[PDB]
Design a protein around this ligand. Structure first.
Ligand SMILES: Cc1c(O)cccc1C(=O)N[C@@H](CSc1ccccc1)[C@H](O)CN1C[C@H]2CCCC[C@H]2C[C@H]1C(=O)NC(C)(C)C
Lengths: 99, 99
């Protein structure tokens, strides 16, 4: 699967039994999801982007299906306006930039 | 040129006669550079990411060299902590996500 970038690279993901749309984001170090509940313990965390910072809950060893590829990683949950798939998970699905 | 994502995808750019490092960012709609001066008119603009918004100056029809590929696009200039190459320019150099 090749994905061109003329439109936002939004893919379907499955996480915590739920189906969501998320943006494949090579500029994000971490994967950040809009508010939802997940299993295990979590830790308070802060992540900065353009403009400022948000408070997030960090969950470890979470199973995620990304465009029908399975990966297990750390997911952050918090007041992001878009679900973000960052490099931590992009590497796990063998995602590369090519030109 | 393929670029894997184990590290931040930082490339060399040349813009306004200057050499800079920038992040190939499929999660950004627009290209945003740290403070610098550029030719022609500019228009005030506000852009949001995670955490909040920043005020930027928008410059049109700017020549940029990205990984040694020439592109002419709109460049935003403002208080970003990282130079960001967004989809507007990524499409111009024929950049795709592959897995
Ligand atoms: C630069 C830009 C535009 O021109 C237009 C729309 C969005 C953005 C934008 O900032 N996008 C971001 C995703 S967060 C996001 C928010 C809203 C919509 C889509 C993505 C970047 O791809 C990632 N972005 C790149 C970079 C931006 C400058 C600050 C340091 C990083 C922070 C990082 C980021 O925010 N990462 C999180 C882990 C906090 C998610």
């Amino acid at each position: 699967p090749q994905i061109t970038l003329w439109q936002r690279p939004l893919v379907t993901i499955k996480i915590g039994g739920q189906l969501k749309e998320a943006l494949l984001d090579t500029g994000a170090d971490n994967t950040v999801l809009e508010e939802m509940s997940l299993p295990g313990a979590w830790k308070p965390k802060m992540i900065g982007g353009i403009g400022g910072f948000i408070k997030v809950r960090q969950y470890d060893q979470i199973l995620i299906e990304i465009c029908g590829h399975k990966a297990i990683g750390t997911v952050l949950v918090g007041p992001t306006p878009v679900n973000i798939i960052g490099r931590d998970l992009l590497t796990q699905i063998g995602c590369t930039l090519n030109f």
